Structure formats: structure tokens, C-alpha cells
Amino acid sequence: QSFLDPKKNWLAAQHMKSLVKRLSKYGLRYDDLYDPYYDLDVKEALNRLPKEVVDARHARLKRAIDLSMKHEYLPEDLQAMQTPFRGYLQDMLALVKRERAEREALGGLPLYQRSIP
Amino acid sequence: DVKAAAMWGVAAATGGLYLVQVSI
Amino acid sequence: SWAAEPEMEERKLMGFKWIFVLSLALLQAAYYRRLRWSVLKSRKLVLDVVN
Amino acid sequence: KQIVPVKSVIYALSPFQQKVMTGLWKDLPTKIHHKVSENWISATLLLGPLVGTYAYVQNYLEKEKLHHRY
Amino acid sequence: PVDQKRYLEESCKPKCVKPLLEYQACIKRIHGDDSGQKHCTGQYFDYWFCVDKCVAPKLFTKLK
Amino acid sequence: GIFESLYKVVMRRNSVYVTFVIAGAFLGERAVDYGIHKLWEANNVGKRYEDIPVLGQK
Amino acid sequence: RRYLEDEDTPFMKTIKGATTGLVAGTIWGTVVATWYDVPRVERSVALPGLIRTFKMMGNYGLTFAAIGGVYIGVEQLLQNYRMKRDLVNGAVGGFVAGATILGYKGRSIKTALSAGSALAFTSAYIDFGGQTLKHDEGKEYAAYTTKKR
Amino acid sequence: EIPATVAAVKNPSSKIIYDEHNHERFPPGDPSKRAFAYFVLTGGRFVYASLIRLLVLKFVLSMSASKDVLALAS
Helix, strand or coil, X not given: CCCXXXXXXXXXXXXXXXXXXXXXXXXXXXXXXCCXXXXXXXXXXXXXXXXXXXXXHHHHHHHHHHHHHHCCCCCHHHHHHCCCCCCCCHHHHHHHHHHHHHHHHCCCCCCCCCCCC | CHHHHHHHXXXXXXXXXXXXXCXX | CCCCCCCHHHHHHHXXXXXXXXXXXXXXXXXXXHHHCHHHHCCEEECCCCC | CCCCCCCCXXXXXXXXXXXXXXXXXXXXXXXXXXXXXXXXXXXXXXXXXXXXXXXHHHHHHHHHHHHCCC | CCCHHHHHHHHCCHHHHHHHHHHHHHHHHHCCCCCCCCCCHHXXXXXXXXXXXXXXXXXXXXXX | CHHHHHHHXXXXXXXXXXXXXXXXXXXXXXXXXXXXXXXXXHHCCCCCHHHCCCCCCC | CHHHHCCCCHHHHHHHHHHHHHHHHHHXXXXXXXXXXXXHXXXXXXXXXXXXXXXXXXXXXXHHHHHHHHHHHHHHHHHHHHXXXXXXXXXXXXXXXXXXXXXXXXXXXXXXXXXXXXXXXXXXXXXHCCCCXXXXXXXXXXXCCCCCC | CCCHHHXXXXXXXXXXXXXXXXXXXXXXXXXXXHHHHHHHHHHHHHHHHXXXXXXXXXXXXXXXXCHHHHHHHC
16 A cells, blocks of 8 residues: 555655554564454464464463553663564454455354354 | 350450440 | 632641542552462463464 | 563562551652653643633624623 | 622722723723613633732632 | 561451451541541631520520 | 732643743854854855754743743632632642753753752742832832822 | 574573663662562552542532531421
């Protein structure tokens, strides 16, 4: 997209800078914000993801929650070493969504449905 | 225990006298 | 003013007493919460992750 | 709803082996600086329309009042 | 028994010189009305609000 | 020292602790009432009902 | 006399004090920035010097405006609470401004007590008199008008 | 390359470092100060008991008789 690219848009660049600063404080990637209970496509993608990646995501989430509980951020060195937006879930999420789309198009039934709360 | 029951009765009586406060 | 609010003196006395007593309660409750959360807010966590 | 396991090592200290309320009024200038700097945009957005609208309403009412003064 | 409120309102005229002069100018400009629809109630209210603001603490200082 | 000795005395048993809690609540309420009444009387001098110069002259 | 001069509702008093404090702080920051020399490595460039000057202007203006606003606001609130104006009415306001604003700048309680005491004394010293350089009004200083007796 | 958790598990060290960002620990050796915390909680319980007692009595006496019927008795 044109306006969403930080190179071509100054507003998008400032938004990306602010998002990087916010994520690096708690030391968790952008894809860590995705909730498995939200879409269940994230749930399927994380199920298909390797155990090492899933464990690293869970460790990052635990660290972020502990930092939020302690009312403190990561130290400066760890914030510098933090690398948000290094995707690990977007490709598999897109693959799951494509599979769901083709299943819906060719009749079929949903492989999983969100339970009525 | 007899002593424990007696002390708990004393505590309950003190609470009742704090609540109702008959002749303070 | 007395006829409209004949309970002003008793109300103000009770309010002063309870405001002071409940400020002391707020101090104690903050201490209690910080003591109960002391184990969680002063713990070291090793997680095997850097980024 | 099931708990996910994370490999970790946790060291915790007894609540009675450490200070409780001393860490509250510590690094207060730094805490206040973080509160001010991280939230000045939010405070401006919350109190921006309010103060400007109040000033505009006061000016409009004053203008009408002097206009209808005969 | 003279009125403390009246005495102090008479004594608060210097504090409200500007509203009093504005009210007097309003009266002078409005003098000569044809039928009605004209009044100086705004200047009157401003002047007496200033006087009332000037008079209350001294008023209950003198009153017992 | 003082805190530890008092802790022993009033918390060796939970029933004794509850009795001490009730007694301390009563005594503290009485002391707070006394102090606030003194402050109220000191602030409001000459305005009490007993301070009216005429009470039986009607 | 001073109270009788102008109305000056307390909110407008506080706004005027904050505005004039901001102006004075801007002027003082500009003066300080132009007085203090630039480093040797910064002599060739001018934009970093201008940026430093602007930052000093902003800092001094903000701190002076905060001091003035806090002082005037505390004085006005104390006047409203006590329903009267006295020497200590503005003396306390000076202490609060120094203790809160200047104390936060120094990041120390001792500076807050030291700066607050100095401002409180200065506010009380001027308020001790009629805020007039000369306190004598019976002296003529000039013979211009004839009088019968 | 050894995992941090594995190294911590396999190397039990006497020198243990806590967070200490908002809770300054006592120096190693001083006794636990549990009496002071218990007495602070005891003062708070004084306060809470007073409030509960007065609320209960207020409700009960409100449900009790009123000044109008008390005065009509004569």
C-alpha cells in the first residue's frame, strides 16, 4: 500500500517509530499481540507453528506481563537488542486464511467454529 | 480444646458488648 | 438554614471522623496490598529469550 | 481456558524480608517525568476540546450580552 | 439603628467606579425614550454585582 | 523489641488477637471522638446551645 | 488602594501571572543562551547553536511561567479560603512555588526548602511595605500650588 | 549457547539477585519484620471493625422507632 509504507509516507514513518518504541519497552514482537482466542485462525497458525517459535512467543508474553505487573520496562541494552516486526505468524496466518477461503468457496464445512458464549 | 473454646467465647462476648454496648 | 438542614452538626462531626479514620484505613490497605504483592513485585524471572 | 507452560526460573523473597512502602516515594522526579512525557499528547487531546470549547462559549455569550445591552 | 449593609454599599462606590460610570452613561444615553423597549438592566446588574462582591465580608464582619 | 513483645502478647492466639482487635477498635473510636469533640468545641466557641445568653427569660 | 484599583478576578490574575512569567523566562533564556559561549567544535555550525538557544528559551520560559502561575494561584486560593488578604497570604504562595517548581528542578528536598524560603521571604518583604519605593506622602518635594493656610 | 534457564537450574548460586526496583530488600542477616506489618494490619482492622459496627447499628436503629412516634407517646 502507498500510504502505509514508511518510506513513502511521513505519517506512516512516525507511526512505525512510535509502535517500535512502544513494543520494545516491553520486549515483545507485534505478532505477540495477536490473541489465539480472538480469531482461532491465529490459534490454528500457532498450532502449525514450530514448538520453538511458540515457546519463544510464550516466554516473550510472560516477560511483558511481568514487566507490566512490576510497572517497569526493559533495560536500555535489552531494548536496543529488541527486534519487533520480525514476523513469524503472518505467513502461516495468511495460509490458514487462504485455506479457509477456498474451503468456504468450495462448499465445505468450517474446520472449527467459535463456541457461543 | 476447652481453653480455645473459652477464649473464643470471651472473644464473642467482647464482640457482642462492642456491638450492642449495654452500659458501655 | 437550620430548618432545612437540622442535622448539619452531627453530619459534619460524623463526616470528619469517618474521613480521618478511612484515610488511616487507606494507608493500612495500601501497606497490606504492597505486602501481599511484595513477592510478585520483587522477583527475578529467567525465561531464556532475548528478542 | 487452560494454563500454558513456560520454562522459567523464578526467585522470590519473603514479604517480611524486604521493604514495603519505601519503594513508593522513591525516584519520584523520574516517575513524574515519565508520566508527563508519555501522556502529554493524551492530556492535550482530553483537555484540548474542553478548554477551547469553554473559551468559545464564554466569548459567544459575552458578545451576545454586550450586543443586547441597549 | 443604621444599616451596616447600606453603609458599606455606600462605602464600596470607589471600588466600582467603572461600572457606576457605565451605568450613568447608559442612563444619559437612554434618557428620552419614546415608548419603551429600552433599559439599562445590564449595567445595573454589573454595578450591583460589583458592589455586592465588595460588601459581603465587611458586612458579616460588622454584623454579630 | 517493643513490636515483637507486643506481637507475642496479642497474637500468640487468634482468639486473643480478635479480642484485642475489638478492644482497640472501641478505644480508638472513643479517642477519635474525644479529640474531634475537643476540636469542634474549640473552633465553635460562643455558638453552642448552652452559650445562648438568654435561655429561660421567655 | 491596589485592590481598589482593578477588579482582576483570580483566574485572570493567575493567567496574567503565568503569561508574564513565560515572557520573562523567554527573555532570560535568550539572554543566558547569548551570554554563554558555544563549544569549539560547534563554532563552524550555526543550527546546533540556534537549537540550543531555543531549548534554553523554552526551558526558562516554562519554569518561570510555572513558578509565577503556582505562586499566584496559591495566593488566590488562600485569599478565597481566608476571605481576607494579609502579609502571610502571599508569603505562603511564594514558598509553594519554590518548593514545588524549583524543588523539582533541583531534585532535592533541601533545595526546595532553600528556594521556598527565599521566595517566601522575598514575597513577604515586598508585601511588608505597600510595594512602594518611598513610604512618605506628607513631604511636598516641590512647591507649585499656593494655599490659603 | 547453554540456555539461561538450564544454566540457572544446573548452577545453584548462593548469591541471589532479585528485582529490587520497587522493593528494596533488607540486607542479608537482619530478622524478618513481621510484627510491624501485623500491627499495621491490626490498626486497619480497628478501623474496619469500627465502620462495620457503626453501619450495622445505623441500619438497625433506622429500622427502629422514630422521633415522631417517640414524641407522640408523651
